[PDB]
Design a binder for these strands. Structure first.
Lengths: 97, 84, 73, 79, 88, 78, 84, 88
DNA sequence: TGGAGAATCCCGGTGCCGAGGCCGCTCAATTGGTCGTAGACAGCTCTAGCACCGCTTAAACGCACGTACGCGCTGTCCCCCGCGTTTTAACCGCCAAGGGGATTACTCCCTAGTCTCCA
DNA sequence: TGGAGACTAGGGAGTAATCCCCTTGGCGGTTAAAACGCGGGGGACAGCGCGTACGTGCGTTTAAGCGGTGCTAGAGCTGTCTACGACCAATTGAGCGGCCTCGGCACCGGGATTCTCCA
């Protein structure tokens, strides 16, 4: 008789655990490779300080967390629970982005 | 600063105003007023952060405590609406 | 928006901040234009919110959302 | 009250201009509340600008600067 | 770098509560941003009125514009008190 | 390397954001939005760096780029 | 102005730069560059406004035409997102 | 006011199209706002590196920062062309 | 109505390194004259904002009533959550290379200050 | 009357070189997460119906609009003129980096206590 959580409870546990914590939630090396790949277009052979990459990662994480909060609000507004692409697009459209 | 009864550097703020090229001339009243405003804001934010820290049973302010102090208050949140 | 009632509203609102204020007609006109533009934009965003929710009748719980997303209240 | 001067037809015309087709009956009170909030947030700054210049006559420039400060820049009323 | 003054203010409000390096840097950045906002607004007000001298009036108007509500009220009161004590 | 932002990372970000349940099509849109935001910040940061005639992007350049977009950031210098 | 073919007042722009205390010193190239940028932007905006006006069959420019031109172009829209 | 120069530019781009008082005032306000933006950004750039001189490079950087995309590129090209023509 | 597996917290034992205090010392904050001038103040002009008040009428207001549609109900199924397995690359410590950030010095060239003129 | 022109000197700029700090690039290796696959249940949703409320037309106020009338509060500006702020310089002490210590915190083990399903 394996004790299995009903679908949904572990999602709420993850929500509580992550909101209770402060550490970053994106792998640092892939993010650094992504930043270098993006900056390759604007200027050739650039060099990034570690603190600059950390600041970029923190800004990106904060922006995504805010966007997901607004997307969750939009989804709840439509009486759904499952956020969808039509919810992120609306949250961006209202902000003007 | 001693005559103004403030813990902020009136002289340093006056130097920042003058070298910052904000205006040609800086009256003597401006640096004292600006230092007082900065001191009041810092005192408010630090008081909120400390009271938040005492709730979390931690005796050292950290970015989490500062964020909680900023977001629990409404006026500061309105001031810091777009600040991480 | 009607001109004279909006002017009376502006004067009533300004009464609280500082008594005995005299308004140039240009300032009142500019305030009315800004109010009209802001309300038109807010109603457009509310229409988007109500279309997103499988509805055509906008509701107060849509304006509230369209202002919560911007961060105005 | 003067806030009631912004009646149903004005709000309906604004909504029709904003794309809305069908409006609920409870929108009007919320629209008046939002309009009052916006007017307060602009008038506070306009009156502060006026009082700074030691004047008792709110002018177009004060309102324009108050709007531009709120990130809602306005053209055609001076400056 | 207002670290020493921020630390003194924190000791004034909380004698026993300290502050971390990251929190100190956050407070320093907050103080710098508030100071830059107020100075920029005072410069704008002085330029608009064409007065080349930033006085206590420009700083007071900038505080009334930037800080909202109770923060504006208390900051203006504190600034007026400090200016009055300094002039006398 | 945009694919390096794996699904569990977006899951953790959404869970932190308070989202109880996620569709399966969010991930591509989230990658697109992240790329747009990173491009917006990096253009300004690289412009600030190129102004100073340097080949090393610093923390101050990124902080100023964030501050010019309305996304002011604290605790990284200024 | 007329020396470089630009209609904008390089002298007036230099006076505005110096009067506003934007910098202690202004180079001899900066006013020319600023005049060119302003002239290009004005020409582009006026051209778009006139083109929008032509669809309305009007021989004069009105704020409606400027509003249409601003809200049509994406780049000008992002530059003037909150302009009434 | 930039009314004469804006009027001449409009007549150059469209000789057969006129302008009213309100449209001219709107264009003047737009030009003044763009000038204020560029000058303020150049001042901030100068203050960042503590260089007290504004040159063509500072204006070019401010144009890249403020104007977006193709507008920024075209403005950079126009400014470079004008400065080269003037200095020659 | 209690029983059972998963998951989190209490008491106590370790280490750690970053917060907290010490102290040169150096460069900036002041205080005392000195001088040029913007802002405080008084006074005059008159522009334009405020208040009355009658005549018009388009616009707001109240009512009636029908129909679009918003919300509660219901059942299909599909696709996302939880999970066990495997595989893959982020990640920690080493180790060097060297490329570019950072002055230090020197020349030299460009722009502010002053005087004269005209569109 | 602000824009244009010429003359003059004084300080920022460009450049060279050197010093060495931080970034890039590897390499080995333990392992913590990604990738993948398999139930299954639960929410998305598409249809249904019914009652509620919103749009439209109609009759009837009513306050906005205009215009005409008046005054007069304070914007707007000019003229003195004095207290204020910039500039300079000898002085000196407050804040800067760099040394140190130590104690509040991080994290784990053993055990106790609490939480989500379930018979």
């Amino acid at each position: 008789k394996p004790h299995r959580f009903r679908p949904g409870t572990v999602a709420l546990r993850e929500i509580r655990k992550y909101q209770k914590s402060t550490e970053l939630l994106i792998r640092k090396l892939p993010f650094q490779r992504l930043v270098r790949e993006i900056a390759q277009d604007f200027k050739t052979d650039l060099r990034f300080q570690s603190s600059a990459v950390a600041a970029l990662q923190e800004a990106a994480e904060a922006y995504l967390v805010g966007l997901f909060e607004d997307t969750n609000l939009c989804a709840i507004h439509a009486k759904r629970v499952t956020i969808m692409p039509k919810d992120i697009q609306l949250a961006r459209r209202i902000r003007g982005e | 600063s001693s005559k103004a009864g403030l813990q902020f550097p009136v002289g340093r703020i006056a130097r920042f105003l003058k070298a910052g090229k904000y205006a040609e001339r800086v009256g003597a009243g401006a640096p004292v007023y600006l230092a007082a405003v900065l001191e009041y804001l810092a005192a408010e934010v630090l008081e909120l952060a400390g009271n938040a820290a005492r709730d979390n049973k931690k005796t050292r302010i950290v970015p989490r405590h500062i964020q909680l102090a900023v977001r629990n208050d409404e006026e500061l949140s309105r001031l810091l609406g777009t600040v991480t | 928006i009607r001109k004279l009632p909006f002017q009376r509203l502006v004067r009533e609102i300004a009464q609280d901040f500082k008594t005995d204020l005299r308004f140039q007609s240009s300032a009142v006109a500019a305030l009315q234009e800004a109010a009209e533009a802001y309300l038109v934009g807010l109603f457009e965003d509310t229409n988007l919110c109500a279309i997103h929710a499988k509805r055509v009748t906008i509701m107060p719980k849509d304006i509230q959302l369209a202002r919560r997303i911007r961060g105005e209240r | 009250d003067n806030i009631q001067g912004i009646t149903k037809p004005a709000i309906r015309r604004l909504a029709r201009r904003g794309g809305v087709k069908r409006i609920s009956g409870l929108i009007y009170e919320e629209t008046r509340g939002v309009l009052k909030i916006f007017l307060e947030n602009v008038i506070r700054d306009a009156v502060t600008y006026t009082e700074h210049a030691r004047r008792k006559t709110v002018t177009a420039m004060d309102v324009v600067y108050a709007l531009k400060r709120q990130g809602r820049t306005l053209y055609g009323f001076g400056g | 770098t207002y670290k020493i003054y921020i630390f003194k203010v924190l000791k004034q409000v909380h004698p026993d509560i300290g502050i971390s390096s990251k929190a100190m840097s956050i407070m320093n950045s907050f103080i710098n941003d508030i100071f830059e906002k107020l100075a920029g607004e005072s410069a704008k007000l002085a330029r608009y009125n064409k007065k080349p001298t930033i006085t206590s009036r420009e700083i007071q108007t900038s505080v009334r514009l930037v800080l909202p509500g109770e923060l504006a009220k208390h900051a203006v009161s504190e600034g007026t008190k400090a200016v009055t004590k300094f002039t006398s």
